[PDB]
Ligand binder design. Structure first.
Ligand SMILES: Cc1[nH]nc2ccc(-c3cncc(OC[C@@H](N)CC(C)C)c3)cc12
Length: 349
């Protein structure tokens, strides 16, 4: 139990449970796996399914999370309908139910997220062959969503889980050290609480800050392309170990974009209602100030992050660069991404 830090606290609205409790004479609670804003993810034995080990997402008894859960359930039912064998790499839902105001969703049990493995491993970047396979599966799973009129909107390393996050301590002679390496790079995409059908109401602000597309920031409307932007940032992150856009501020974010990617298109600058960020038709950002120095020193043009001159590394950056195109309509689609030369070192299953 932790200390509450404000009136509106994240600790409020959870279902109280203790290890060993059974929910609905069915789900025996084995351990707590994580806590997000929505509630908790718990490991359970499902006793009405041969004792299968499952992940149970127990949602807070708070209306906004209860609403998000209903939308997620609807999205997962679509996923199950269109992908009965659970082949398109989005997490499989088994069952859902209302427990005294707390929505509960049952999923296949999975390992640590691609973020948490990275974090626990000292942010040591994934080797490129792992980046390739992880990125490929990510593009497959989200392409499936894009084919069925869906946009995830909150893609990030925390929402990409290893099927099994077991690792090997392999010997690295170059550094005279031992290093952790995940044995299997099979992944699933999770958390569909923000996933939006083409025809549904679009929230103005979507995505976690680091993964947010420029059309979202400038409020130009967003659809599937904003997922591709997120994927571009995620892939970069797998390759170097740190976020591409380390910021929490629109103006700074947009400045970092310009520094990493070049000037924002005029069409977007003139169209946006966020005129506050612009002066005389260009980003209102003084590079010569202390704020400007920070951006100049802590990020650089995208390609300069290459840690090797080998063609397969350049191919990776061709991929990222195409995903981080400013204009959503010019940005690489996920169907195009799967045909990209970077992935070639894989043969169809
Ligand atoms: C371990 C595991 N096994 N199977 C799972 C199926 C689904 C989920 C999941 C569902 N919705 C949201 C999620 O958030 C991930 C991250 N954003 C916040 C964490 C602190 C929980 C994860 C986890 C699963």
């Amino acid at each position: 139990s932790r200390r509450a830090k404000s009136v509106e606290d994240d600790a409020e609205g959870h279902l109280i449970y203790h290890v060993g409790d059974w929910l609905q004479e069915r789900y025996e609670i084995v351990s707590t796996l994580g806590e997000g804003t929505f509630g908790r993810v718990v490991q359970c034995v499902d006793h009405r399914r041969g004792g299968a080990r499952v992940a149970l997402k127990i949602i807070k008894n708070v209306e906004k999370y209860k609403e998000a859960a209903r939308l997620e359930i609807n999205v997962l039912e679509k996923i199950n309908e269109k992908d009965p064998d659970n082949k398109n790499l989005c997490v499989q839902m088994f069952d859902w139910f209302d427990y005294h105001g707390h929505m509960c969703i049952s999923f296949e049990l999975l390992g640590l997220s691609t973020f948490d493995f990275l974090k626990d491993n000292n942010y040591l970047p994934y080797p490129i062959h792992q980046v390739r396979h992880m990125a490929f599966q990510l593009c497959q799973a989200v392409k499936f969503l894009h084919d069925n009129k869906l946009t995830h909107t909150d893609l990030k390393p925390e929402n990409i889980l290893f099927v099994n996050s077991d690792y090997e301590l392999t010997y690295n002679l170059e550094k005279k050290r031992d290093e952790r390496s995940v044995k299997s790079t099979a992944v699933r995409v999770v958390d569909f609480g923000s996933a939006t059908f083409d025809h549904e109401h679009h929230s103005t602000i979507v995505s976690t800050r680091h993964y947010r597309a420029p059309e979202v920031i400038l409020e130009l409307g967003w659809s599937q392309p904003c997922d591709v932007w997120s994927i571009g940032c995620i892939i970069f992150e797998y390759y170097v170990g740190f976020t591409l856009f380390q910021t929490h501020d629109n103006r700074e974010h947009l400045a970092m974009m310009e520094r990493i990617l070049g000037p924002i298109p005029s069409r977007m600058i003139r169209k946006t209602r966020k005129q506050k960020y612009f002066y005389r038709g260009r980003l209102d950002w003084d590079e010569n100030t202390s704020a400007g120095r920070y951006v100049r020193e802590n990020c650089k043009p995208l390609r300069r992050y290459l840690t090797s001159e080998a063609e397969e590394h350049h191919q990776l950056f061709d991929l990222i660069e195409s995903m981080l195109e400013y204009e959503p309509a010019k940005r690489l689609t996920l169907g195009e991404a799967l045909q990209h030369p970077f992935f070639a070192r894989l043969r169809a299953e």
